[PDB]
Design a protein around this ligand. Sequence first.
Ligand SMILES: COc1cccc(OC)c1-n1c(NS(=O)(=O)[C@@H](C)[C@@H](O)c2ncc(C)cn2)nnc1-c1cccc(C)n1
Ligand SMILES: CC(C)CCC[C@@H](C)[C@H]1CC[C@H]2[C@@H]3CC=C4C[C@@H](O)CC[C@]4(C)[C@H]3CC[C@]12C
Lengths: 315, 579
Amino acid sequence: YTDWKSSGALIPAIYMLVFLLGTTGNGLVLWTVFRSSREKRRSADIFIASLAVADLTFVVTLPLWATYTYRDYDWPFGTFACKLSSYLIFVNMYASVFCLTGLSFDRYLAIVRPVANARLRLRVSGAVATAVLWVLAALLAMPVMVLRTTGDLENTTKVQCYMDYSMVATVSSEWAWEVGLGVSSTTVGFVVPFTIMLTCYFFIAQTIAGHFRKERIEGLRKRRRLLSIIVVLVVTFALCWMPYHLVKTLYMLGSLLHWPCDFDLFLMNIFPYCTCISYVNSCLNPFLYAFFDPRFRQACTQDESCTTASSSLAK
Amino acid sequence: TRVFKKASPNGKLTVYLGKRDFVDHIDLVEPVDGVVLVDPEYLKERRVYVTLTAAFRYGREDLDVLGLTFRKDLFVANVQSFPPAPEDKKPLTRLQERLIKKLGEHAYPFTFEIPPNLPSSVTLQPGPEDTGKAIGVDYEVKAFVAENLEEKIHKRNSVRLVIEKVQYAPERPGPQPTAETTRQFLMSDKPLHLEASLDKEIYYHGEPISVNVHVTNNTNKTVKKIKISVRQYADIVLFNTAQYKVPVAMEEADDTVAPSSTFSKVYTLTPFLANNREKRGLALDGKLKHEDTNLASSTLLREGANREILGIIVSYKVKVKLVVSSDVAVELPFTLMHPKPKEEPPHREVPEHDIQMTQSPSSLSASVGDRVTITCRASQSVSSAVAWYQQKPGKAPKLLIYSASSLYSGVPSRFSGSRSGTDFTLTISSLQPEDFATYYCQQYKYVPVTFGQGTKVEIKVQLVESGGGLVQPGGSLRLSCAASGFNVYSSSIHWVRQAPGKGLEWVASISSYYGYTYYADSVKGRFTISADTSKNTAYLQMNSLRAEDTAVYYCARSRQFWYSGLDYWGQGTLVTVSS
Ligand SMILES: COc1cccc(OC)c1-n1c(NS(=O)(=O)[C@@H](C)[C@@H](O)c2ncc(C)cn2)nnc1-c1cccc(C)n1
Ligand SMILES: CC(C)CCC[C@@H](C)[C@H]1CC[C@H]2[C@@H]3CC=C4C[C@@H](O)CC[C@]4(C)[C@H]3CC[C@]12C
């Protein structure tokens, strides 16, 4: 049940690398959005902005956790600081997934139902969607706030930050409360946004393949490139997020399956690495979403059609 | 007559097309016929290909995912004008033959035939802020030079002319749209029997839609209100068929029907664009450019033949609703279309948003029966968009000529209009005694609508105006023009003054359908023109009046749809603004 010998020597290091990359990417995209907002005036951009915010506020709280893992999981910061940090991480995880799903649905509505795209008031529809997204994210994170506390010195004088279950869960309600909260967190954080995104991108892929199937050579290459981009987006989301929720679900399954002696040790060893790879999207997001937008690239850096005249046709 | 020409960026190809508006009779569509002027020097051994493309831009903008373009070519047809393929064996139309005659030998004909069942040129409303391009069906004629059908088309030797394919109202009126709903409730004694009815099936644009709503509430439950709407149904049938319904004009009448009581009322609704300018997705008539157009005309189809025709199909139904204390609704279809116009539609706003018109000779006298010619030179090209009026002394002008050539129904055939570039001429062949009058020439292409100094030719349904008076050196006066027989939505009310011993000067003009009011520079802020439909009455509120405004103000009417002139006038009111 102990941690990997080489774990603590590295988890802070990978966290630090994630800090650097997540800053230089998310802050960059947010700064670009603020700098270039009226220049683009694109409705979907709001989600990008929101995503950036979440990602930034996802990684801003990283160092406290790095130092936490530094001293055998000891928390040299405030208890309110622990609550705020954990609640921020969860709020931002859910906000990131919801913003990615919202962008996927926006693209579905602007690619697979484009006749209705102009009918809807995207400017205010997106704002309302982001408002509900963020309010709901904060609501789902309210528990992972209230059940957050500090202590667990275990007569070892190590003041650590965690999610206390005793304050609500009774002696026999610990397992039930834990499994229920874990189920709700994982489902609302991965499943529904994930399925929505997958259906949206499948419809986008089918429509784009059908649309570019005309013409030859150039059209087919462009279609393959677009399908490759849709791939890389779905694949990067899956790779980055699946390990985290998978280990959560594995914990809840093993609560009764009772992985005897080694699989559980593997779960605890890998989970910090799971968080590291979960930050993969928060890191790469500018490359796939901002950089993929030509406006971001521009910010970083005999065709006259004449005129329809008129002549005299004498009889 | 006159024809349209668009040259290429290089200057070698020039596409000549007679008209931009091709009628789609339900069975056969008018062919697109034209002439391409080709310079052989540039064409060493190349070919001239002209293509008719019926596109449907179903998605705003493009490259949303860096490569996706939403533009489906509903129908593309290619014909090679140069070198003429001997397999053509086509008979040149009159316009094509005349164009080939006017041009040299190097003019080459090209004629496409549009298939019968195709969507008509319509564009859904962009909305307040979309820029880019509009979602809708468009038609394009593109003439380019290439050595093969698949060679990369160069934007330097290609000309693109946007054409519109349209339908006009059928001559024979259809059956009277009357539909009735008999609805019962928990009190099954006797039901409501709403029996709404319109007046006719064909309602030309901007004209009223009478709705006789006969109700007999034999059941206890009352009806608090009657809500009549005119809903435009846009069926978009690309990939996924859809039916969008955008309300256009409504009336939330508060009339009530007591239990076991009857009630009859004729409600009147008029669909216009002024109050629907914010309704995104609304179907409007095909636009050549970003210019104002009317609500989309109803699309006519052959019975049992709508094979999910790709494009946008526009219909209209009037939905009457009784709000019982369970709405009781009846829908009445009706076709809302332009009548067939003798002259082609102007796909630009006719008094487009100051062209001096020097008219000569100011004074000229001649005997009875001889031929008299009157010239008028415009400072800038008016594009055959002048008209000629006749004002007898102490009377109102009467529209004689419109479009610089066309005679007005009811005018002697002696009068004839002609054009010589920017010099528009009016000829009277036999000067009968009924010709002594002042003849005025008006350019109605550019607002301010500019009249001429007037030529005093010597022989040697209604509008009523009120509100004159020799009063208010600097006060206010509201001139009222009551229009009998005319709807302010199918017509535009123009207040044009005439100072004593002076020519007509255009003061104000209100067009309700598009809902814009224009004023002259001298009355830009002082005056306010507003026409209310409660009595089909226009009003001109005249504030800060000066001595220069002493004039016989006239209230004239111009066809709001394909402006032809100030055909109908009023007696006029003398506003003697003096001490
Ligand atoms: C490794 O994880 C943490 C480390 C340090 C601080 C933490 O918190 C802020 C988190 N952490 C927590 N802690 S925990 O809840 O105690 C979690 C440890 C417990 O449940 C659990 N043990 C084992 C398994 C297999 C599954 N589950 N839960 N999520 C996050 C989190 C963190 C970052 C990013 C994201 C998306 N999530
Ligand atoms: C074109 C633009 C304006 C479309 C705006 C509406 C979009 C963004 C809406 C439509 C459906 C919405 C999703 C529906 C369901 C869920 C699950 C919920 O627990 C969190 C929000 C989330 C993930 C929503 C996010 C926003 C969403 C994708």
